[PDB]
Design a protein around this ligand. Sequence first.
Ligand SMILES: Nc1ncnc2c1ncn2[C@@H]1O[C@H](COP(=O)(O)OP(=O)(O)OP(=O)(O)O)[C@@H](O)[C@H]1O
Ligand SMILES: [Mg+2]
Lengths: 109, 448, 55
Amino acid sequence: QSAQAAHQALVEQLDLHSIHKTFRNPNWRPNQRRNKTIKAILGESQTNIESAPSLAPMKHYCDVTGLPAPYLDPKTRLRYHNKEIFAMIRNLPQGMGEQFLEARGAHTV
Amino acid sequence: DEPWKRLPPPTVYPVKEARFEKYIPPQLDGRERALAQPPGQVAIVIDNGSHSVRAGWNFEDKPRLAIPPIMSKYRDRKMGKTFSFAGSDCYAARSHIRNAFEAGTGIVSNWDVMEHVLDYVFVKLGMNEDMPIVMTEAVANLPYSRKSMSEIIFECYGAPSLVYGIDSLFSFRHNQGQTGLVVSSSYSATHVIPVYNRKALLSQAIRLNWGGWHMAEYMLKLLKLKYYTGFPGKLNSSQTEHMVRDFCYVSLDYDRELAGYLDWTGLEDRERIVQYPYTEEQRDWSKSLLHAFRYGPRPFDPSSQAETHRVHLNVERIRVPEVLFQPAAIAGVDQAGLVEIAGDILCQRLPSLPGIQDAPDAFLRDVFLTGGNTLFQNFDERLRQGLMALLPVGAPLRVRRAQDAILDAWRGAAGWACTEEAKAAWITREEYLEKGGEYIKEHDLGNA
Amino acid sequence: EGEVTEMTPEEASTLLIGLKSARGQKKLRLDPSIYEAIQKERVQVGDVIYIETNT
Ligand SMILES: Nc1ncnc2c1ncn2[C@@H]1O[C@H](COP(=O)(O)OP(=O)(O)OP(=O)(O)O)[C@@H](O)[C@H]1O
Ligand SMILES: [Mg+2]
């Protein structure tokens, strides 16, 4: 199929691997473990330490709709705007309450 | 009555994605003129952006290349051969993509991906056996990451000299920056850096861990929650990034604009509707706040394939930019907001410094906005109003846009690249062999 | 008229009161007796207060 042949032509035209990089030193080879994570790199250092929490009190927003929330649900710990959203919050499927806390970074773990 | 019957048919915008579009042959024209340019006055300029790697020749006004820092490599089972890609050639059709940076972080971490990106950069620049290299660097880049990047440049590519500088600060000097407060919001982070006598006070810089990547991720969560019952389209972070770019804006009065945002009157104008591609073969919805939130003023039926395949952004038009100003309240980032960060610098830190002269007033006369993630509407105006309330009355506060928010850091690095100031800061290969890649020349635009 | 940003004593009794509005801040050196007037009103940091500085 010409479209597939053209697609082959594109990837063959785009591929780097078929190209010899003459500027690349052929003798140099990396340490395979070099791809450390940022947590590991900091741990191996034991300035990229650069902010702190606010002391101003925090505004309250509805976990469902982001509108201002007067209310904090005791049961599910979601903040909610009104009786319509409280009703919906109490009828969420299993685990959806934690899914709303995850957007706030407040999930149970 | 049926007020929605009065409304026009909704205007709807197609989804957009990061996509392949055009090939780029090796630009050997550039190599030829680079050899013609005067001695000691050519360099390769690499803005090492987590959103886009920008590269080109110092003697030119634009990068010749702008490429996502991604690779794709796979063994094709049918052609029997390896394929390798770096950048938009990854179509971003197997999409086995890997990214050079750690997620949401301005620091390079996949060095094999980084080498593939640089190979692509040099091939497209036409390097065919070299010029010295100017590399932009994260504001407090980790020593190990500086070490690793140096090793690749000197030992794999053999380059004669390398210098690292900070994209925020190059942008400032390109815009006649002399003393000021540099406010950068990038893909990876938001920074506020005081700059004095053209020299940055990096000891007084602050990083907010929110940026244009985090906005795309956060917008994705909010959409997957809004339609938690099920959206048929394949929601991904790349689509929401274009939604944040196209539709979000900063509020000038968040908690009063927000409190009325879902009111039915005029929600037809406040909502914006994104269409995913589809195939076709006394108490009701008109009083439901959740209907207005999810579907706007129009009635909804799940029979219409088109209407089932569209998202309504609504409150997320303003809720997403406001994370910069209210990180803990909107997204739970336990960090001070942008106005409180910049205010604490001007109010507390700089007037405490010895020998600083007229702090804050000297800095306050040029608050400067850098980086693509500042390009939201009202971003400057919001920052001005916020700072104005923290400063003695009548203080000469100015907030200023960079002339370009994304290329301008490369343009600054390119102009600086071959100056005597830069060439004093260059590290040669032999200096690298003496000192190792962790050593760096202290200079006004670079890390300590 | 503004939100109280600071209430710092500066005398053995004279305060500095910081006042804030949406348009800027100002600091006022307080006569010891108007300070007591401010103290009989239950003013604290974060309160909004009105002051007639002449009367
Ligand atoms: N017009 C626009 N309005 C809002 N955001 C935009 C606009 N154009 C681009 N952006 C966003 O700005 C970001 C790109 O920023 P930029 O290219 O300056 O970052 P970078 O240099 O890659 O970042 P870093 O220094 O973190 O590596 C992306 O999140 C992109 O979606
Ligand atoms: Mg950048």
